[PDB]
Enzyme design. Structure first.
Site, short mmCIF file in Angstrom:
data_model
loop_
_atom_site.label_atom_id
_atom_site.label_comp_id
_atom_site.label_asym_id
_atom_site.label_seq_id
_atom_site.Cartn_x
_atom_site.Cartn_y
_atom_site.Cartn_z
CE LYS B 62 2.85 7.09 -4.47
NZ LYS B 62 3.66 8.15 -5.08
CB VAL B 63 -0.05 -1.62 -1.77
CG1 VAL B 63 -0.26 -3.11 -1.84
CG2 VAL B 63 0.99 -1.30 -0.68
CB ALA B 64 -0.55 -1.43 -7.44
CG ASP B 65 0.58 -8.05 -6.23
OD1 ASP B 65 -0.09 -9.04 -6.59
OD2 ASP B 65 1.81 -8.00 -6.49
CB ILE B 66 -3.81 -10.33 -6.46
CG1 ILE B 66 -2.79 -11.20 -5.73
CG2 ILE B 66 -3.54 -10.27 -7.96
CD1 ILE B 66 -2.91 -12.70 -6.06
CB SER B 117 0.91 14.64 -8.39
OG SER B 117 2.14 13.93 -8.28
N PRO B 170 0.73 15.10 -2.62
CG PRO B 170 1.21 13.15 -3.88
CD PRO B 170 0.11 13.83 -3.07
C1 LIG Z 1 0.35 -9.86 -10.01
C2 LIG Z 1 -0.54 -9.38 -10.97
F1 LIG Z 1 -0.39 -8.12 -11.47
C3 LIG Z 1 -1.63 -10.12 -11.37
O1 LIG Z 1 -2.42 -9.72 -12.24
N1 LIG Z 1 -1.85 -11.31 -10.80
C4 LIG Z 1 -0.98 -11.79 -9.89
O2 LIG Z 1 -1.33 -12.86 -9.33
N2 LIG Z 1 0.12 -11.10 -9.49
C5 LIG Z 1 1.14 -11.77 -8.70
O3 LIG Z 1 1.38 -13.02 -9.45
C6 LIG Z 1 1.60 -14.13 -8.56
C7 LIG Z 1 0.42 -15.11 -8.60
O4 LIG Z 1 0.80 -16.21 -7.76
P1 LIG Z 1 -0.22 -17.40 -7.38
O5 LIG Z 1 -1.63 -16.87 -7.45
O6 LIG Z 1 0.00 -18.53 -8.36
O7 LIG Z 1 0.14 -17.77 -5.96
C8 LIG Z 1 1.75 -13.50 -7.20
O8 LIG Z 1 3.13 -13.14 -7.03
C9 LIG Z 1 0.89 -12.24 -7.31
O9 LIG Z 1 1.36 -11.20 -6.47
C1 LIG Z 2 3.23 9.34 -5.40
C2 LIG Z 2 2.00 9.56 -6.00
F1 LIG Z 2 1.08 8.55 -6.05
C3 LIG Z 2 1.70 10.75 -6.62
O1 LIG Z 2 0.58 10.97 -7.14
N1 LIG Z 2 2.63 11.71 -6.67
C4 LIG Z 2 3.82 11.51 -6.07
O2 LIG Z 2 4.66 12.42 -6.26
N2 LIG Z 2 4.13 10.36 -5.43
C5 LIG Z 2 5.34 10.32 -4.59
O3 LIG Z 2 5.21 11.53 -3.76
C6 LIG Z 2 6.49 12.15 -3.55
C7 LIG Z 2 6.59 13.48 -4.30
O4 LIG Z 2 7.86 14.04 -3.94
P1 LIG Z 2 8.45 15.37 -4.63
O5 LIG Z 2 7.87 15.49 -6.02
O6 LIG Z 2 8.07 16.55 -3.77
O7 LIG Z 2 9.93 15.14 -4.70
C8 LIG Z 2 7.49 11.14 -4.08
O8 LIG Z 2 7.79 10.23 -3.00
C9 LIG Z 2 6.71 10.41 -5.17
O9 LIG Z 2 7.14 9.08 -5.34
#
Ligand SMILES: *c1c(F)c(=O)[nH]c(=O)n1[C@@H]1O[C@H](COP(=O)(O)O)[C@@H](O)[C@H]1O
Ligand SMILES: *c1c(F)c(=O)[nH]c(=O)n1[C@@H]1O[C@H](COP(=O)(O)O)[C@@H](O)[C@H]1O
Lengths: 214, 214
Positions: B62-66, B117, B170
């Site tokens: 659920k990658v959610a970074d920059i 979900s 899911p």
């Molecule tokens: C996470 C985040 F949710 C943000 O809004 N912005 C952000 O940059 N991050 C994380 O912060 C650090 C920034 O490092 P830099 O740009 O000084 O190298 C990183 O760990 C980034 O993942």
């Molecule tokens: C991740 C996600 F982004 C969703 O919208 N919903 C969701 O449940 N997940 C992940 O899916 C699996 C659901 O497993 P279950 O509820 O059948 O046990 C989990 O890995 C959850 O993190």
């Protein structure tokens, strides 16, 4: 935090991460460890850093799952020794509450990520970010993350969370944010690449503090 | 995927995870591994599962970074042997593009998470989810995740992404979703707890397939 400066340690090699962190330890109190390092070297790196440097560790995992899974992620992260975890607010109040419940169980802290610092944050997150901050206030969150790259948004976020709340801010240096203008609103700045990619990370850290002390 | 069923392996102990996955292997093609297992047992668990079961592995991070950090996370995850990674669309197009670039470099796939979900998804994500799906289409994303718990939303998401795109879902079982009504719109269902917490996971998996084959 010491000198209002948190190191974002996103190097992916344990030796380089240990070297840079050791070099800048006199300037920082707090190391932020995220998935670039953890997925490369393992969760044990958290306890190693905590022991070897005696620094508080924030696990920047930007937790963004369903409540059940968020609970599991927080449990594993605190078991590994982290002092605090960064969680996204965008997935809603139940997902945040799950993290707060585990932090309570284990005497640790949650930081709520409101608005992100990168350009794409404008697409969807920015429009929700004031509400995300209010949701935090309504849940009793005391620690927040908001963007160095938009000090007008920091100002608004500070307005919502109040003066009591602790606010930390990434996007300083590499992403274009300024230490001085960020610290008008944030309690501490997060700095990664400007320090860890510098030819002399201690000199880079020292230079940032020299702009903070003024 | 085999029998349109993906196992969400969120047990936190390597032995239990290996046991349950082995028990249900004849019913599945694809194992989804997330942070509950990875943060407990390490990234090596991905290559171990891939080798020992000969199953495709989706890393549900659920990658959610920059963008910069997303690149690092994707690189580490594909280096560990994952076939695909799940990334959030809410942080915007640059963050998604970063993941797509790494998947290109390494001949792997990205799944774009649109709407989640759980109940809290209604707060902020649901209102953005159609746009998130269109953004995916505009970036050339071919693989998507959407919620079993809201088949009317699945329907709409399917409408946006087209019949060509691959959609997994899911929220089946524990969260209240139904295999049959989800597979009207999704190509495959993700199931975790209904299988891995069952007294007999093979019987639970077999029972789900028996409702799919009809
Ligand atoms: C996470 C985040 F949710 C943000 O809004 N912005 C952000 O940059 N991050 C994380 O912060 C650090 C920034 O490092 P830099 O740009 O000084 O190298 C990183 O760990 C980034 O993942
Ligand atoms: C991740 C996600 F982004 C969703 O919208 N919903 C969701 O449940 N997940 C992940 O899916 C699996 C659901 O497993 P279950 O509820 O059948 O046990 C989990 O890995 C959850 O993190």
């Amino acid at each position: 935090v010491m000198n209002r400066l948190i190191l974002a340690m996103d190097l992916m090699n344990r030796d380089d991460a240990l070297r840079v962190t050791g070099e800048v330890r006199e300037y920082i109190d707090t190391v932020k460890i995220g998935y670039p390092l953890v997925l490369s070297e393992g969760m044990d790196i958290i306890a190693e850093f905590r022991k070897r440097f005696g620094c508080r560790i924030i696990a920047d995992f930007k937790v963004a799952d369903i409540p059940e899974t968020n609970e599991k992620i927080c449990r594993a992260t605190f078991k590994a020794g982290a002092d605090a975890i960064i969680v996204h607010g965008f997935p809603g109040a139940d997902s945040v509450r799950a993290c707060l419940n585990v932090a309570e169980e284990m005497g640790r802290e949650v930081f709520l990520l409101t608005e992100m610092s990168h350009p794409g944050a404008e697409m969807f997150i920015q429009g929700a970010a004031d509400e995300i901050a209010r949701m935090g206030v309504d849940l009793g969150v005391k620690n927040y993350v908001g963007p160095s790259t938009r000090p007008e948004r920091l100002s608004r976020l500070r307005e919502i969370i109040g003066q009591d709340s602790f606010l930390i801010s990434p996007g300083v240096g590499a992403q274009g944010g300024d230490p001085g203008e960020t610290l008008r609103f944030a309690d501490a700045i997060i700095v990664g690449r400007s320090i860890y990619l510098a030819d002399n990370p201690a000199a880079a850290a020292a230079g940032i503090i020299e702009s903070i002390k003024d």
